[PDB]
């Protein structure tokens, strides 16, 4: 049974005591606001051993910007651990997975193959997708004036994700970018009908996080700072 | 390495049809004959032939160092100003000369048109000049004074070299021959200047001996009304990469004269010149400030204009 | 000056007119990427069109010797 | 992409034509379709379709790699390249990193080209590894490189050896530089044991010179080209382990007096780190991080181009 969202992050989901069944969340904000820092915070919580405050559940990470900094992750894990050593961090990393996707078609091919991963790793109960909006500009040109043609591949990936999230009760933390102009939707409808919570990031170092929950149309606000130890919720 | 069709210069409409049929990388289209590729997609045989042509179709620092020495610098008869520039106005690079009107930019432009024709055996470059005049300041009779004066100066050295080959290059160097290699171009509006700049890469390929291109006036004296929309697409893109590439493939020097700047036209303009000089007054005495350069630190010098032409103080 | 006098194909001229382009001046103000969109031509093909259009307005060359001799 | 003979064993025209007739053209449709409706109906062997689908899916998809295994490779292959300028090296925390896209910002004559030449000379002489300098504005000057080399050593053989280790290329339009980058990628792919080359650094002088013309009007063809260039640089960096360096202009947002890059919101997400250069004197340039994944921003300091 997947752990409830209120356990993954008590400082964001303080009213989600029920076990999760295929929820989806999204991050949105300008550059250098902390979207990738949060994914390190959540990733650290889920791979650390239970003796050190973690949950001990594997994680899968999908990258399409090539911005994943291995050193920045490891420096966090050594800090958080009470007594960090090389032979300890090895096991902490042993529950982390990574893939790179170069184009929407490559991503779609990867998704159809990821069906085999979860059939072999039942503990894999988290899924992260960085910069879902990487191929927007390229694809919007190859599709011509016909909107249906512009979004064809992005729609298929959306239909694939929803199928994976429910067959195995995962949590998807997608990430997007502020490319046009608070909020300005540009992705397809086949995807925007899936997101439950949409969270926004701002800059002033103090970072302010605003959460909107379309499940109940409730708005909140949080604060946090980024230090050498990672994210700290005020 | 799976080149992607968005990186190729294929026409936008044809690319849409190609991708819709399922083609993603250029490596797929290499084997298919043009006859079949015209049927799988809704394009004509001519397009099928043009497309497959695009799909299929250097020097180290040591080598560039050798070429840099050999390619002579253009002198200005001002040993002071020529000293800060490193020897003279260089080839394969763009230069700019800013300054308020009435300071002598056109005099320096004219003096360079003559100094590019000096024979090589005196340390010159032996090239012809192109003078794209936008302000209509060209005065041929002035070149005569700058020309005959230079020959007299050139004559005063050959007598000390005695029987060297200078006595033949001096015969080759004459007033009529000098004036028979200065090409004029009168532009009266932005459209004419754009048209001329578009055709210049052709005019230069026909005359391999040209070694200096001058653009007397990058900003028209009366940019007004709707013309301001025409100025864009010339300072943008046009006069930043057309002049650099033209001045490099043909191995020549380009000089742009500017009038707006007057102190020590678009924010991105400042990056459009490899070198930039500024002329201004001080106590009613001319100055030649160097403001930007990737090989010479900022410095200032003095100069004066005499009937004999550009000269030191 | 109007484009149809320059020497462009009649068919193409209509494709331009449907975008509210009538004079050579309007034609020159567009960048190469725009002209590709509004013509269907490849990158090199647009340069040939630009050369053709400019060849009807560029100034006439004049040697310095000639002007001195009037 | 589109199906073709030889893309994998077991494919022929007499079957590819059947698939094409049945509205199955590319690999995506083949793997996203229903095989039984195509096998029992329309007369195709179910086992053959399954085998073909699995082979294609395996061949044209990513394969997840554990974190522990990747950590060793990263720690062993990653390296830090000194930039020569001692102070700026401290600001960057030992300098450039292999596998990331670095960017430099600054107005006219703020030392963007001088810093690039300094890194090129230092990498050519100290570490003695090759360098590719993609020049888009004629900034490169052979004499300045020789001068900066002389500032380090006086031997004439060492200088001659160093100057032959720097390749120079020219690209004054978006397509030429894309061709150059793809050619470099192909050369590195083919040459697996040619250590005589093995470019370890890339310097793209004024990446804003070949992108600013493409942007303009209501068209969107320029954005796709810029993003294609960004993907090219990203793959060059990450996949091949070459410390790419880029140079960009600056501008002031109309709403406030702050400085920012010039290529817009889409570009700002590309670089993995940014260094802003500004003037407070011929030299005495001031540097301060504006973007990084390992240090706080806004750490202002001083450098002097008069010596470097
Ligand atoms: N170790 C650290 N100590 C202090 N501040 C840090 C540290 N690492 C990163 N930061 C700061 O925290 C922020 C990091 O943001 P992050 O890496 O999450 O970017 P992002 O939102 O993914 O950006 P983008 O999408 O534009 O690439 C930046 O302000 C960076 O300066
Ligand atoms: N030999 C030198 N000694 C000292 N300073 C020098 C030297 N050569 C150049 N400079 C300085 O370098 C400055 C030019 O900087 P640089 O060539 O790096 O500009 P840039 O960033 O490429 O500019 P642009 O935006 O126009 O491309 C000159 O103004 C001068 O101050
Ligand atoms: N034959 C000459 N002898 C001395 N001075 C001259 C001669 N011809 C022009 N000048 C000086 O040059 C100045 C004009 O410079 P000009 O060519 O207009 O510069 P710019 O082109 O930058 O405006 C005048 O003030 C004039 O005094
Ligand atoms: Mg990020
Ligand atoms: Mg004048
Ligand atoms: Mg430069």
Residue numbers in the entry:
A (entry chain D): 20 to 200, 222 to 244, 251 to 280
B (entry chain B): 10 to 66, 84 to 290, 301 to 349
C (entry chain A): 4 to 73
D (entry chain C): 2 to 281, 287 to 314
Question: How did the manuscript describe this experimental structure?
Answer:
Here, we used cryo-electron microscopy, AlphaFold2 modelling and structural proteomics to define the high-resolution structure of the RAD51B-RAD51C-RAD51D-XRCC2 (BCDX2) complex, revealing that RAD51C-RAD51D-XRCC2 mimic three RAD51 protomers aligned within a nucleoprotein filament, whereas RAD51B is highly dynamic. The proteins assemble into two distinct complexes, with RAD51C mutual to both: RAD51B-RAD51C-RAD51D-XRCC2 (BCDX2) and RAD51C-XRCC3 (CX3), but molecular analyses of their structure and function have been hindered by insolubility issues. Biochemical and single-molecule analyses showed that BCDX2 stimulates the nucleation and extension of RAD51 filaments, which are essential for recombinational DNA repair, in reactions dependent on the coupled ATPase activities of RAD51B and RAD51C. Our studies demonstrate that BCDX2 orchestrates RAD51 assembly on single-stranded DNA for replication fork protection and double strand break repair, in reactions that are critical for tumour avoidance.
BCDX2 was purified to homogeneity following expression in baculovirus-infected insect cells, and high-resolution structures were obtained in the presence of transition and ground state analogs of ATP, ADP.AlFx (2.2 Å) and ADP.BeFx (3.4 Å). In atomic models, the three NTDs of RAD51B, RAD51C and RAD51D, and three out of the four C-terminal RecA-like folds (RAD51C, RAD51D and XRCC2) were observed. We were unable to resolve cryo-EM density for the C-terminal RecA-like fold of RAD51B, but negative stain electron microscopy (NS-EM) 2D class averages revealed a mobile feature relative to a structured core, irrespective of the nucleotide present. Thus, the C-terminal RecA-like fold of RAD51B is dynamic and RAD51B’s interaction with RAD51C is driven primarily through the RAD51BNTD and linker. The BCDX2 atomic model revealed striking similarities between the arrangement of the RecA-like domains in RAD51C-RAD51D-XRCC2 and three RAD51 protomers assembled in a nucleoprotein filament, by the stacking of the RecA-like folds and nucleotides bridging subunit interfaces. However, in the RAD51 filament, the NTD of one protomer binds the same protomer (in cis), whereas in BCDX2 the NTD of one subunit binds the adjacent subunit (in trans). Finally, the alignment of the RecA-like folds of RAD51C-RAD51D-XRCC2 relative to three RAD51 protomers within a filament shows an open configuration (25.2° decreased curvature), in contrast with RAD51 where tight protomer contacts provide the high degree of curvature required for helical filament formation. For the cryo-EM analyses, BCDX2 was vitrified in the presence of ADP.AlFx or ADP.BeFx. However, we did not observe density for AlFx or BeFx in either cryo-EM map, and instead observed that RAD51D and XRCC2 bound ATP whereas RAD51C bound ADP. We therefore suggest that the Alphafold2 predicted structure corresponds to the active intermediate during the ATP hydrolytic cycle, whereas the cryo-EM structures represent the ground state of BCDX2.
